[PDB]
Structure formats: C-alpha cells, structure tokens
C-alpha cells in the first residue's frame, strides 16, 4: 500500500523556520518524482515544490512566493522527501500534501493526508471545556472555548458514540478558536448511561474529559 | 503561472439531474508530446483531495462512468451523468503542462433536496464556566435545508448581536443537510443580571421563527 506518512507541521513565529518530513513506503522511492503541495482558505490548492530523480542531481523546482525561502529535498535511503522552510509569513499557513509522482499523468494520483502549518504571533493557549447539559429524544452538546492553535480532536465516550454528532468547525475570534460539539441520543439511555465529551489539544498537552450531569 | 478559472463556483443540483462544470486556462494545455494535461479532482471537507480524471479524459481506478471529461486546448468540461448525493464536495481543475503547476478556484457541488425544519437546542452556560467568570449561552440548529439561515438572539427582551459565533457544518453526504452552532459570549456579570435568554431561528421552512428559550 502507497502511504505518505507527513510530519513536522506546528506553530511557528514569523520569521521563524520549519522542517516537514515525508516518509514514503510501498513503493521503489528513488524511482519517482515527489511533491509538496500546500492548501489554504485564501489562495485556495497551490504547488509548493517539485524534486526529480538522482540522474539529473535531484532538480528542484519551486513556487515563486517560496524561492529563496523554501528547499525541498530527499534522501532515497530513508525514502524520504523534506521541506526546510525559512523566513516563514502568515501567508505560508495552511495544509502541507505530500504527493507521489507527477500528477499529470497515470500512477501519480496518491497524496497523503497531510499536516498543519500554522504561521502566527499568538501564543498557544489551552480550551476551556464545559460540558452542555439540556435546560422526544435528548441533545446534548460540548463547548470546546479559546484555544491556540488549531487543532482539537473531541469525542464522545471515547470514540464509542459516534452516531447523531455533529462537530462542528472551528471559529477564529481574537486569536482564539471556538469548537462545539452537539450529540442526539434516546431519552432512554440518558441520563440513565453516562455520557462524557472528550476533549484533546495536543498543542498545549491537553486531555480533558468533561461528563454531562443535569 | 496559467489561470485556470472555474464557472460556476457553487453548484446546486438535485439527485439524478445531469451536471457540468467549466475550466478555462489563460494559456493552452496542449504539450508538444501531443497530450493535453488537464487533471479533475474532488475535495471532501477535511479530507486529502482525491484525483478523479487525468490527460482530459481517463478516469482514475475507483471513479465511476458517470464522471466525463471532455475538452481540448484552453477549454475543458467536466460532465456529470446523474448526481449522486456523494458527489458532494469542491471539485478543482488542475493543468500540468506548465509550470508551476496551478489549481482552479473550485466548484463547490451542493446536493439540492427538500427543505427541512431544524431540530433546534438551547444550552445554559456551564458550572464550570460561570464559577470561572465566563457565560456563553449554545444554540444548536441540527439536520436542515437549505443552507441560508440566520439566528437571532434575546436577552430579557432585547437582543443582543455581539459576542456571537456561528459554525456551519459541511453538508452531509447521506441526508444532505445542514447543521449549524450559534454561541452567545459574555461575562457572568452579564449572565446574572438577567433570566430569560431565546435563540431565535429564521428559516423559511416555517412562517414564524422556531423558538426555544429559558430563564434564570
Ligand atoms: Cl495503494
Ligand atoms: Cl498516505
Ligand atoms: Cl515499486
Ligand atoms: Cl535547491
Ligand atoms: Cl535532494
């Protein structure tokens, strides 16, 4: 199986610098072209770098808003390809995509699920949990209030309930994310089971868990 | 770096109707090696944009007859036989013959069904939050269509429009509505001073706006 395992991405100040990985497996690395490609609200899908193959010292192409700045590489060895990024701006947030391959043609379609990039001033900041409990069936809801940066990972009974949620995206307001989450269960398992709103933000070394009480 | 520009950018179709989309490239993407290098692919909220079409017009394994791909030189089109409500999602086109290589704007397809009411909760701040100086009141409006709809908040009476956040979901890909999150901010100083709070909804699946408040 063709997998794109990306790493790297965080917080980082302007001006500062970063290193995104790319470990491939499944396939014969040396043997094919690797990509980066970035994706952000404002500028949408963009192409950051490309890197040939060693025949041709590993030829590098590169996004005019990222030269000089911005060095793709790989290491056939580790069957790796990196990003080093310097003097980075808030413009360079976003999305960061792995890709195997030239894209334009057959064999080249496989992207990895990619990681976050987030390029800001604002200091990492940890959410405020509270549990929703109500005032047919039952709603209940979680409220995930001012954290930094993106992003949070909410569950609910340790990923067991899964159905009737909906977690709702994340809002930036002052330097700070809002997340809420509501659930939808029969009036005969709550409160009469135990529902709980898990709640992770690895960015500040958060694990909260938050059970909903009348 | 060549332009390429999608028409339309929201489109809204309902299930089995026929669908096209439109890509436009500032300069012509047929290579001199005779290929034309035209890429369609499909975006699902939160998830790695998939590739659906490749060279104009051959599909990517997985991808069903019922995408077609067509086109030559600066203008392409990608034609949808009947659309299923899990064709949802941004659709990009993408060029290869120069580069930088370079993505269209997007064609967000919306899965047009029946209107439907939303399921509507209020939430009273917390324990935790109140004890700790804050108070934010949660409105949920789950499971509706269409997608436009606004919610208007009360406080004793009168309203209040700031300190509100609002959150859209994504339209789902099974019954494809809507949900969407309204949370009133403010201080327990705030909060204290006064009883009954109401989110109000506006939607025109109903002619008066569906209402659910408390008071303390
Ligand atoms: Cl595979
Ligand atoms: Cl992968
Ligand atoms: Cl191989
Ligand atoms: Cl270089
Ligand atoms: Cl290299």
């Known amino acids: 199986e063709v997998k794109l395992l990306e790493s790297g991405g965080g917080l980082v100040q302007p001006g500062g610098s970063m290193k995104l990985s790319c470990v491939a497996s499944?396939?014969?690395?040396?043997?094919?072209?690797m990509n980066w490609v970035r994706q952000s609200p404002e500028k949408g899908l963009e192409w950051v770098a490309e890197?040939?193959?060693?025949?041709?010292?590993?030829?590098?192409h590169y996004a005019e808003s990222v030269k000089g700045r911005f060095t793709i590489s790989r290491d056939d060895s580790k069957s790796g390809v990196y990003l080093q990024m310097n003097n980075l701006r808030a413009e360079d947030t976003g999305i960061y995509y792995c890709?195997?391959?030239?894209?334009?043609?057959?064999?080249?379609?496989?992207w990895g699920q990619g990681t976050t990039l987030t390029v800001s001033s604002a200091k990492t900041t940890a959410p405020s949990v509270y549990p929703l409990a109500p005032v047919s069936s039952v709603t209940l809801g979680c409220l995930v209030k001012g954290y930094f940066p993106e992003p949070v990972t909410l569950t609910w009974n340790s990923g067991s309930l899964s159905s009737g949620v909906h977690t709702f995206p994340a809002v930036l307001q002052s330097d700070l994310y809002t997340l809420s989450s509501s659930v939808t269960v029969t009036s005969s398992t709550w409160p009469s089971q135990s529902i709980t709103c898990n709640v992770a933000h690895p960015a500040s070394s958060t694990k909260v868990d938050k059970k909903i009480e009348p | 770096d060549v332009v390429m520009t999608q028409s339309p950018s929201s489109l809204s179709v309902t299930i089995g109707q026929p669908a096209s989309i439109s890509c436009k490239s500032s300069?012509?993407?047929?290579?001199?090696?005779?290929?034309?290098?035209l890429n369609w692919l499909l975006q699902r909220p939160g998830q790695s944009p998939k590739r659906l079409i490749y060279?104009?017009?051959k599909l990517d394994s997985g991808v069903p007859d019922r995408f077609t791909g067509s086109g030559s030189g600066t203008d392409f089109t990608l034609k949808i036989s009947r659309v299923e409500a899990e064709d949802l999602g941004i659709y990009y086109c993408?060029?290869?013959?120069?580069?930088?290589?370079?993505f269209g704007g997007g064609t967000k397809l919306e899965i047009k069904r029946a209107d439907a009411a939303p399921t509507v909760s209020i939430f009273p701040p917390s324990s935790e939050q109140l004890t700790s100086g804050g108070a934010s009141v949660v409105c949920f409006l789950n499971n509706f269509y269409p997608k436009d709809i606004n919610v208007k908040w009360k406080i004793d009476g009168s309203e209040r429009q700031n300190g509100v956040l609002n959150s859209w979901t994504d339209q789902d890909s099974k019954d494809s509505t809507y949900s969407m999150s309204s949370t009133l901010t403010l201080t327990k100083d705030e909060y204290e001073r006064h009883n009954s709070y109401t989110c109000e909804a506006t939607h025109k699946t109903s002619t008066s706006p569906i209402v659910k408040s408390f008071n303390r």
């Open positions: 890709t195997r391959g030239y894209y334009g043609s057959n064999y080249g379609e496989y």
């Open positions: 499944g396939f014969t690395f040396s043997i094919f072209w």
């Open positions: 890197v040939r193959l060693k025949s041709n010292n590993y030829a590098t």
């Open positions: 300069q012509s993407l047929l290579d001199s090696d005779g290929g034309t290098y």
């Open positions: 060279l104009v017009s």
């Open positions: 993408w060029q290869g013959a120069h580069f930088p290589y370079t």
